[PDB]
Amino acid sequence: RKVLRDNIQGITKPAIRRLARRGGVKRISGLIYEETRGVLKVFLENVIRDAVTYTEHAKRKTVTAMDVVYALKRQGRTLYGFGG
Amino acid sequence: NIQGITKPAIRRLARRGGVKRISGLIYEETRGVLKVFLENVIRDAVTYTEHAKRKTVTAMDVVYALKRQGRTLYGF
Amino acid sequence: KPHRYRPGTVALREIRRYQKSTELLIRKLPFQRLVREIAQDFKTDLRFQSSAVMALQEACEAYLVGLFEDTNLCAIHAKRVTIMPKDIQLARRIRGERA
Amino acid sequence: PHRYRPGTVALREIRRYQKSTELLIRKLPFQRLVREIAQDFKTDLRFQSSAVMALQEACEAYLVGLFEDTNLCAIHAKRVTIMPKDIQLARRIRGER
Amino acid sequence: KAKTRSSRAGLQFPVGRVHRLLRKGNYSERVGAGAPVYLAAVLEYLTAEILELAGNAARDNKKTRIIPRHLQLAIRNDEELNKLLGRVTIAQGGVLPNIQAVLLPK
Amino acid sequence: KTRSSRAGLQFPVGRVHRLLRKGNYSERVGAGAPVYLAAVLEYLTAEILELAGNAARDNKKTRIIPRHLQLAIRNDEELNKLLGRVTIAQGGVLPNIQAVLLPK
Amino acid sequence: KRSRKESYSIYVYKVLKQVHPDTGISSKAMGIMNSFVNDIFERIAGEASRLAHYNKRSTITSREIQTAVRLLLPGELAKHAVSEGTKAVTKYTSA
Amino acid sequence: RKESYSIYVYKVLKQVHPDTGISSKAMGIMNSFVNDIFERIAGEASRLAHYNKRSTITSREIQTAVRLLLPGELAKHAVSEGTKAVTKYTS
DNA sequence: ATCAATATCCACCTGCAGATTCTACCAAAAGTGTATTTGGAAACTGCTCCATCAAAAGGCATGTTCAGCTGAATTCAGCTGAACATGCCTTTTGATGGAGCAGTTTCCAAATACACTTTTGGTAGAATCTGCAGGTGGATATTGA
DNA sequence: ATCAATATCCACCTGCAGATTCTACCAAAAGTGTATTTGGAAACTGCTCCATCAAAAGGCATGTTCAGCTGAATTCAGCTGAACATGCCTTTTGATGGAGCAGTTTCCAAATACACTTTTGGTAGAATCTGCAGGTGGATATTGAT
Ligand SMILES: [Mn+2]
């Protein structure tokens, strides 16, 4: 395929903006964008790590939605609508 | 009774907490939240005792209740 | 005129707008790449179910939207209307994510 | 006469307490408080002497903690005096309210 | 003839399923016969509560079909249901509109 | 001949295995599980005792008290993470004072 | 090679008609519903196991479910819960 | 009756710190720690089993659970000891 | 005090992607006939848990003084929001190949089930022991001059 | 920044009692030997679903301009909350005693568990429907310049 790298910049500024708006924020400092990305990247890592761990226990090469869900549950971030 | 929780005591608690300056309003306020803590912990605690049917609240009842509240406790 | 909207006016308009809709704010394709990149580093040659990537994106967006509200309250609390990393960092500190 | 400037003892207090682990709240008043609260839920209950400790340990531990968070909010607003306003935020952020 | 156990208790939810799921769940070694019904009833009720509040939301919005948004609103507007589902996130739920007091114009 | 000596552990493997059965955690308990868990529980204890020792030794006491334990748990980043939600009785807090509070 | 997985879908729907005959629910919303049911189901049963275990009981009585409900459900919702259950049980035993 | 891990913790304490001793209260704290972890590892382990439609908990299930519950070095060392004790026990 | 300027609102429109129904099998409740437990249900302890009752002594409540902390008001350098212009790339749509779940089967390696025999770990005394607790005597940290 | 005069901590010291740890032994478990069940690893292989790639296209992300107004800096002072010497009473604590009451037994009638056999109630395709998503337009604000 194609090598993947520095895709964390995929999370654009407008989009981070939009997420903040829905959060009710009217004014955003410029440093926010990069900081947000940082937090987002950490969230994903932690949740994907567990997720994939559930996948590794199953021996499946595919991460099902459940994997993600069980993962989120451990993280105390329960999700409704995908696998249970 | 909740007034048993004296102002100097609350001040002490805040110290251990790292506070240097306390508004005079905190106290009643520090008192209020406290009252709530027990209300929630004990309630669940007793429910456990009642299911048990005992007329005495073991140290254990509290532990179980604390865990349910997320505020886990060690040593009892 | 050219007709122009005073600063902050549009922001208020966006806030009302995005709060009403439920669609995902982050662009689907780029997120997916990010998710696949991060996951590739933990385990090589993994495969993701269409539904699995969505799940991840829903939780993320939800987390961030949520973090922003708290952050906003930290900004309002510091007398400022502008959110700042100083706020986000505090908010997570109180949340306990990383004291 | 000699008088300690304001805030000096405070810091002397802070350093002193963090060093000791003894509970700060007076035991009997507390136990009196606990029984009172317990009665609304159930009547003529009895508590293990140890049961009260657990309860007291938890509350002081929680209260001490709440203040740490309270301080950060007070510090964060450019102040050095914790206010009820700060306490509510910390709790609102925590999810308690 | 043949009667469903749920009908005996007059519930819509499947008591047989609830009982069997309790057995296979390893929650306990013995599952009383009253528990499955009791439980099954509790969920049915909670389901009706949630469905009720959503319905209106759908009508409030002039929709005859319940979508997630309505559920989120239902769950977040009611103080108690909110509490019960405080840690949860509904996919596509969006958020209760709310602009801070200070942020408004003047 | 204790199964624990076979695995070379101080903790009771039998206890853990009997505990796993009465726990309702699962239908059947593998033979390797008990030793593994038991084993893992041993190490963790080891880890915290060692650090408390230091705390104790550092404090000048030959006997460990809760404070030593709390000091040990909280100073270590990883142990803190694991027991973040837990609270030790008589643990007190680590001694920390905000920079700004200090005299300028 | 069918692979039939079950859901509370049928049951949620019946209940949807009871509260609002004219209203209907969507796929995405149904899923959410099933999750709610399942989540709550786990909380009560899991929390019920604790009661039983804490009291060295080998069986989960309909009674343990109730006590779990009190702890798990808040306020009026809890009260109604207990009411609907007991009703269901009392009716069941009496038949 | 009334069994505790108190006896076992002491032995472990002695290896690392022969010179040191532990108070009654601290012992209790240690027993609590052991129990929680025990419950925490077993719980998860159970879930791994259920999620995977397994009816039995292998040592592996205990391990995978350990990777989720413990972080970084604590996990690594923790996982090692388990496998090590198991490999030795089976021999 | 006006009013264009622009965005926001609400009802009408209408095929179609996403329900609602409609049906046939069959996985799993329901019905029955026994084979075990289970948790009560009276009796009874040994105890932890209330109750006083009784002195003293920290520890708490107060009224005082004023030091410096929080708020309010004034400013203005420039950070960040609102507009456009540009054209990149995320979306949409659909086609294929095939990696890799998953449903079946097959059956040993492993775990469960008793019947006993042994060894261990919890208790209650019995013989040590670290600290609590004061008690100097001496820099140390504060603060005013 | 010293000088000096308080008040504080702070090691060096040192005495017995509330704990710890060590003993001395007995039911409870754990370890064994046998004998059976059975869970799920290995071995196919049907066949969704996931990865990919090609194409057209407009939804939007980027960069740049400008300048409105927010964040940060200052300055001031009214007044809130620390530091304190004061005077007094509720918390300590310590038995002492009696008893409400956890905690044990020991049967056992009621409730569960099992083992098989019927019997529907669901679930997974199809055949049929129909809210409503995606547009269009006027009416209705809301804004921001004068
Ligand atoms: Mn990479």
3-state secondary structure of H56: strand
Q: Please state whether beta strands F87-88 and B73-74 pair in parallel, antiparallel, or not at all (unpaired).
A: parallel
Neighbouring C-beta atoms of residue E60, cutoff 10 Å? 10
3-state secondary structure of G24: strand
Domain span holding position D26? 1-97
Tell me the Cα Rg of chain A: 16
The residues, ordered by sequence, that sit 6+ positions from C40 with a Cβ below 8 Å of its Cβ are: A4, C46
Using the structure block, give the residue that is written with the tokens 């009820």.
Answer: D84
User: Distance, angstroms, CA D77 to C1' J75?
Assistant: 20
Pairwise CA distance, residues G36 & F80, whole Å: 33
Q: At what angle do helices C85-95 and D84-94 cross, to 10 degrees?
A: 70
Q: Number of structural domains, chain C?
A: 1
Residue in E41, E40, E54 with CA at minimum distance from that of residue E85? E54
- Give Cα separations from H23 to D17, F83, H13 (angstroms): 22, 21, 12
Pairwise CA distance, residues E93 & B76, whole Å: 43
* Bridge partner residues of F64 (DSSP): H22
Structure tokens given for H84: 């090590």
What CATH superfamily is the domain A1-84? Histone, subunit A (1.10.20.10)
Residue F87 phi, psi dihedral angles, 5° rounding: -125, 125
Residue F7 phi, psi dihedral angles, 5° rounding: -90, -10
For CA atoms G20, G21, G23, G24, the dihedral sign is positive
For CA atoms G17, G19, G24, G28, the dihedral sign is negative
Amino acid at G60: I
Contact D29/B5 with Cβ under 8 angstroms?
Answer: yes
Cβ C50 to strand J below 7 Å: yes
3-state secondary structure of A77: coil
The structural domains of chain G, with segments of one domain joined by +, span 1-95
End-to-end CA distance of chain B: 26
Structure tokens given for G39: 């989540």
The torsion of the CA quartet F80, F83, F84, F90, rounded to 10 degrees, works out to: -90
Pairwise CA distance, residues A5 & A13, whole Å: 18
Structure tokens given for D30: 């507390």
Residue in E97, C21, C80 with CA at minimum distance from that of residue A23? E97
* Bridge partner residues of F88 (DSSP): B74
* B11 Cβ under 8 Å from any chain G Cβ: no
Q: Which chain B residue is nearest to residue H6, measuring alpha carbons? A: B75
User: Residue D34 and residue B38: Cβ atoms within 8 Å?
Assistant: yes
For CA atoms D70, E80, C25, A39, the dihedral sign is positive
Pairwise CA distance, residues D82 & D67, whole Å: 8
Contact F89/F66 with Cβ under 8 angstroms?
Answer: yes
Helices (H), chain F: 3-7, 13-23, 32-59, 66-75, 77-82
* Architecture in CATH of G1-95: Orthogonal Bundle (1.10)
The torsion of the CA quartet E75, E77, E82, E87, rounded to 10 degrees, works out to: 80
Q: Number of structural domains, chain E?
A: 1
Contact H56/F27 with Cβ under 8 angstroms?
Answer: yes
User: Closest nt to B6 (CA→C1')?
Assistant: I60
What B2-11 contacts at long range (C-beta under 8 Å, 24+ apart), as own/partner pairs, is B2/B31, B2/B34, B2/B35, B2/D33, B3/B31, B4/D26, B4/D28, B4/D29, B4/D30, B4/D32, B4/D33, B5/B30, B5/B31, B5/B34, B5/D25, B5/D29, B5/D30, B5/D33, B6/D26, B6/D29, B9/D24, B9/D25, B9/D26, B10/D63
DSSP state letters, E4-70: -HHHHHT-SS-HHHHHHHHHHTTS-SEE-SHHHHHHHHHHHHHHHHHHHHHHHHHHHTT-SEE-HHH
Contact F47/H33 with Cβ under 8 angstroms?
Answer: no
Determined by which method? X-ray
Record the resolution, in angstroms. 3.4
The residues, ordered by sequence, that sit 6+ positions from B23 with a Cβ below 8 Å of its Cβ are: D81, D82, D83, D84
Pairwise CA distance, residues A13 & B35, whole Å: 45
The DSSP element (H or E) to which G70 belongs, if any, is: helix G62-72
Domain span holding position F56? 1-104
Convert G47-71 to b/e letters by CB count within 10 Å (16 or more is b): bbbbbbbeeebeebbbbbbbbbbbb
Q: HSE (CB half, 13 Å, CA atoms) of E81? A: 21
Pairwise CA distance, residues E44 & E24, whole Å: 21
User: Residue B72 and residue F86: Cβ atoms within 8 Å?
Assistant: yes
Residue in D63, B38, H32 with CA at minimum distance from that of residue F66? H32
Residue H22 phi, psi dihedral angles, 5° rounding: -120, 140
Structure tokens given for E97: 């509109």
User: Residue H51 and residue A56: Cβ atoms within 8 Å?
Assistant: no
Q: Residue length, chain E?
A: 106
**Quick one: how far is CA D44 from the chain centroid?**
28
Contact G19/E52 with Cβ under 8 angstroms?
Answer: yes
Please report residues of F whose CB lies closer than 8 A to that of H21: 62-64
End-to-end CA distance of chain C: 52
Could you say which of 1.10.275.10, 3.40.1260.10, 1.10.20.10, 1.10.287.10 is the CATH number of the domain covering H1-91?
A: 1.10.20.10
Q: What is the DSSP letter of B56?
A: E
SS in 3 state form for H41-55? Answer: HHHHHHHHHHHCCCC
User: Distance, angstroms, CA H65 to C1' I102?
Assistant: 25
- Give Cα separations from F47 to F13, F92, H80 (angstroms): 19, 21, 14
**Quick one: how far is CA A31 from the chain centroid?**
20
Q: Residue length, chain F?
A: 104
Contact H32/F82 with Cβ under 8 angstroms?
Answer: no
What CATH superfamily is the domain B1-76? Histone, subunit A (1.10.20.10)
Residue nearest to nucleotide J123 (CA to C1'): G4
Pairwise CA distance, residues A60 & A38, whole Å: 30
The torsion of the CA quartet G33, G34, G38, G44, rounded to 10 degrees, works out to: 40
Q: Is the peptide bond before C2 cis (omega within 30 degrees of 0)?
A: yes
Residue in C55, B43, A38 with CA at minimum distance from that of residue D40? B43
Pairwise CA distance, residues C75 & C98, whole Å: 19
User: Residue H59 and residue F10: Cβ atoms within 8 Å?
Assistant: no
Please report residues of F whose CB lies closer than 8 A to that of H69: 82
Residue F63 phi, psi dihedral angles, 5° rounding: -120, 125
Structure tokens given for B24: 């005079």
Convert H59-69 to b/e letters by CB count within 10 Å (16 or more is b): bbbbbbbbbbb
Contact C39/C46 with Cβ under 8 angstroms?
Answer: yes
SS in 3 state form for A28-75? Answer: ECCCHHHHHHHHHHHHHHHHHHHHHHHHHHHCCCEECHHHHHHHHHHC
Neighbouring C-beta atoms of residue D27, cutoff 10 Å? 12
Q: What is the CATH number of the domain that holds F28?
A: 1.10.20.10
Amino acid at A52: V
3-state secondary structure of B73: strand
Pairwise CA distance, residues E48 & C25, whole Å: 32
Residue G11 phi, psi dihedral angles, 5° rounding: -65, -40
